[PDB]
């Protein structure tokens, strides 16, 4: 209810499709549905756009002329922020790292990174995002002292404000489903947490599972919980639901493809004409599939996979590294 | 009323809702004229595009006749082939693609990245040829060999551009008319003109719904002399199928595609950079970049019949950006 008290820009408009996947369902022997948050009208789309609706509205209210964020070279978030900035006539400054130590030309210059150049993003390279919030604040102070009005967007757009975007997706989900499980990639945690708050109130019987793409359960759980509480607090709701996380599917680490993940990509492509990605959704789908094999879900009814986007990264990861 | 026979053709649901029609305030401010964009690049299937509109009718036709295989042709970086392959996968139809290298490039990203990468993901059977000198005959030869294996092939022509395929853009015109209604009085529409189905579909639709609007195709592969009869033939065939006449003159501009099909040019790349930096919109080096360069220059030279609002049809093509980088 209090969701409408938050300023937001319209970047998406109509609710994204929720689709049945008959061929994948037939193959896995389980009813699988997909939330197509990969289909959004801005610069090849994705989940970060839902967050930016709130974050950029806040930016404009604060009178910013510059958006500053951070991510890997192949960040979907940075690409979406850069496109949104260009659309609104805002400057954009991206703080980037190479998280996998690659020198592969396509990772360094193609995919999302190519798009950043098209969007006229000012690029700042750092050796590592060891303390992103801190490093972004340092950068913002320079730019502010330089004569600009920056607005800092945290890594993956995952603040309590940004995460409102995924409380919003939860409303679409609830509307469109009128299910036993929901599966989503859990990275910077805004998507997971927002969905957790929304689904708790809208679909309490449904098990929400985050498949981690960068961290162990131990490392990831406190982050998702912290966001869950902050979101609930700002909406004047209670959030008591357990956070469920599966960390078996991201090795050897963030932004490195693995076989299970790339095989998930091939499966969805060949069976459904759907495009996943090597960093996020492929790994999450690999988790979904294994959850079936291992009978890992609370019960064995329909599963909703949340497609958070990421496909432009296919072109940066080809042919390897 | 006049486009009612369109109801008769069976068609599949690939798009769902009408695609967004958006004002471009920053581009409009720069160009000194009201620019709107029809977002046909924003469709739900495998990175979208205009070809998906045609496939709705072509594939419905294939299913009706009991086909289990789709066969079509294009460049290695064809958007059509990629969209055909994606649809085939989704429907559990087999897909065979006859590909050529139209520009003689050895650049690895052209050969293996972009649309061509996606083809492998959709399990497309790839069939290379030196050139598409006679695509109708080459597709038919391939269909004979495919049929010998026991498949039931349905041949989709280059770009999905038959009268039936073009019905998708008659439908697009209906959307456009409804979307502009009481919101904007369009003076002009710009679309890239390639295999001609999109242009022809729009020509018939717009003649009957928005008769005063000037439709302009920017050629991406041929001169006016070569392209114009192709568009007209389709236009007349589309009108016939709908029990309508189509008396409108087809308008084409061929100044914006040199040195040739699939070869990027400066004006095209500047248009791509302009749309990206001003509107966060991604065009492509083969089709939309060149069409936009046409629009821009059309404003500059006052080539349009009337200087009112222009609607640019975004036909898609963005995955090729990754194939054309860093060069071909």
Residue numbers in the entry:
A (entry chain B): 4 to 181, 186 to 328
B (entry chain A): 1 to 328
Could you pull the original sentences from the published paper?
Significant activity was also observed with βCDA (Km = 0.84±0.30 mM, Vmax = 173.4±82.1 µmol pyruvate produced/min/mg of protein). The crystals of StDCyD obtained in the presence of D-Cys and βCDA show the product pyruvate at a site ∼5 Å away from the substrate binding pocket. The additional electron density observed in the complex is consistent with two different binding sites for the substrate. One of these coincides with the canonical active site of fold type II enzymes and the other is 4.0–6.0 Å away from this site. The electron density observed at the active site pocket was not adequate to model the ligand used for soaking the crystals. The density could be modeled as a sulphate and two water molecules. The density at the other site 4.0–6.0 Å away from the active site could be modeled either as product of the catalytic reaction, pyruvate or final intermediate of the reaction, aminoacrylate. Examination of the residual electron density after refinement with various occupancies for pyruvate and the aminoacrylate suggested that it is more likely to represent a pyruvate. The modeled pyruvate is held by hydrogen bonding with Arg222 and Ser221.
D-cysteine (D-Cys) moieties are found in firefly luciferin, semisynthetic cephalosporin MT141 and malformin A. D-cysteine desulfhydrase (DCyD) is suggested to take part in the catabolic degradation of D-Cys and D-Cys-containing toxic compounds. The polypeptide fold of StDCyD is similar to those of other fold type II PLP-dependent enzymes and consists of a small domain (residues 48–161) and a large domain (residues 1–47 and 162–328). As in other PLP-dependent fold type II enzymes, the active site is situated in a large crevice between the two domains. StDCyD is specific for D-Cys and βCDA, and shows no activity with ACC, although it shares significant sequence identity with ACCDs.
